[PDB]
Amino acid sequence: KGEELFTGVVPILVELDGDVNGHKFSVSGEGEGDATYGKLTLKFICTTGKLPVPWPTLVTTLVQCFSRYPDHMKRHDFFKSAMPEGYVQERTIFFKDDGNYKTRAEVKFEGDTLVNRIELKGIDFKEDGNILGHKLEYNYNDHQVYIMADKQKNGIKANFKIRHNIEDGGVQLADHYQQNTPIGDGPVLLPDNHYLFTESTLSKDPNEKRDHMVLLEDVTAAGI
């Protein structure tokens, strides 16, 4: 049972190597997750300088194994069942009337730490659009994630639409396509359709001079 690896507090490391329209950047994150309470506390920094995209656009890319699955839902927790070897998480994120991100990540244990190691490639962006022009508010509108089994890839899939507030009014749509497949060869829990509900709070560290994002989340699975 991979669920047994989440009965306490787990340190988290996130690493992202990114390229949007040829603008290279890297993000490092650290924090902890508590799947018993469905809680994440993370801080991310851009290690290469100024982040060339808005922090909110990276939230979904920057660990669904920390969702709180209530007792009656344990049999549907694909994410923990793939641990410790982990899973590959891939997305395409289409920003309406702008470019798209393609992401590939390994989510797995390295020793006692849960890592999320990501490659991100963004193409076809407007150099002064809402993304590369930094026209998005520093806040978040979460959206429910309808998880479906992807039995041919022995994993899961989802399609969900995130709304990013535009400065001075307006919404920028980010249409997320997601598929996850186990890294290990052992059996995993292929779930019935269900939701993940997340609540994200973005803040800043007054003492942090690097471009950064403090991120807290509640994450909960729900049936039907």
Side-chain angles (χ1 to χ4, degrees), residues 15-165 167-212:
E15 307 271 34
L16 180 141
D17 282 324
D19 168 341
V20 176
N21 280 27
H23 309 302
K24 316 285 198 174
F25 65 96
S26 293
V27 169
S28 298
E30 66 164 22
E32 55 206 32
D34 192 322
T36 302
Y37 296 88
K39 301 217 179 243
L40 297 158
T41 174
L42 296 150
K43 176 179 174 184
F44 302 92
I45 70 180
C46 180
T47 56
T48 52
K50 197 206 172 23
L51 196 68
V53 300
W55 281 110
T57 71
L58 301 178
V59 168
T60 51
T61 301
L62 299 168
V63 290
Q64 298 169 304
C65 46
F66 287 104
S67 310
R68 178 176 63 90
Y69 273 76
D71 266 357
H72 69 96
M73 299 283 294
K74 288 334 181 63
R75 82 141 307 260
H76 303 294
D77 191 346
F78 160 87
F79 307 100
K80 296 185 191 53
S81 81
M83 288 310 159
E85 309 106 289
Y87 54 78
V88 175
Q89 185 161 291
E90 290 169 280
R91 290 214 184 95
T92 307
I93 304 171
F94 298 98
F95 293 93
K96 187 56 208 294
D97 299 316
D98 217 327
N100 64 83
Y101 296 163
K102 307 236 164 232
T103 68
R104 189 180 175 95
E106 289 182 2
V107 183
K108 78 210 161 145
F109 274 93
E110 289 183 1
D112 63 283
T113 296
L114 190 284
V115 311
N116 180 16
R117 304 192 174 272
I118 307 142
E119 193 158 321
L120 179 149
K121 184 86 170 252
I123 68 176
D124 292 334
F125 282 89
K126 296 162 169 164
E127 293 295 333
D128 198 52
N130 291 324
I131 288 79
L132 285 187
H134 296 98
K135 293 159 205 223
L136 300 187
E137 290 182 353
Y138 187 75
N139 55 34
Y140 211 77
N141 304 302
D142 296 275
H143 200 88
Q144 75 200 339
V145 176
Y146 187 52
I147 301 283
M148 302 178 78
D150 187 359
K151 331 158 217 286
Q152 269 262 296
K153 286 132 204 227
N154 189 37
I156 59 84
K157 54 198 217 183
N159 176 216
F160 57 103
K161 277 137 175 91
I162 293 287
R163 299 161 72 251
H164 284 122
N165 291 342
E167 295 278 11
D168 302 320
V171 165
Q172 164 75 67
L173 172 74
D175 194 0
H176 285 64
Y177 284 79
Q178 177 179 343
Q179 48 192 128
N180 294 38
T181 188
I183 288 171
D185 278 341
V188 292
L189 273 198
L190 295 175
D192 287 347
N193 294 359
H194 66 284
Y195 300 101
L196 297 181
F197 300 111
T198 139
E199 284 96 32
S200 314
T201 303
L202 310 198
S203 55
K204 295 284 188 186
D205 176 1
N207 288 334
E208 178 58 73
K209 284 172 182 189
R210 309 151 182 92
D211 204 352
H212 72 278

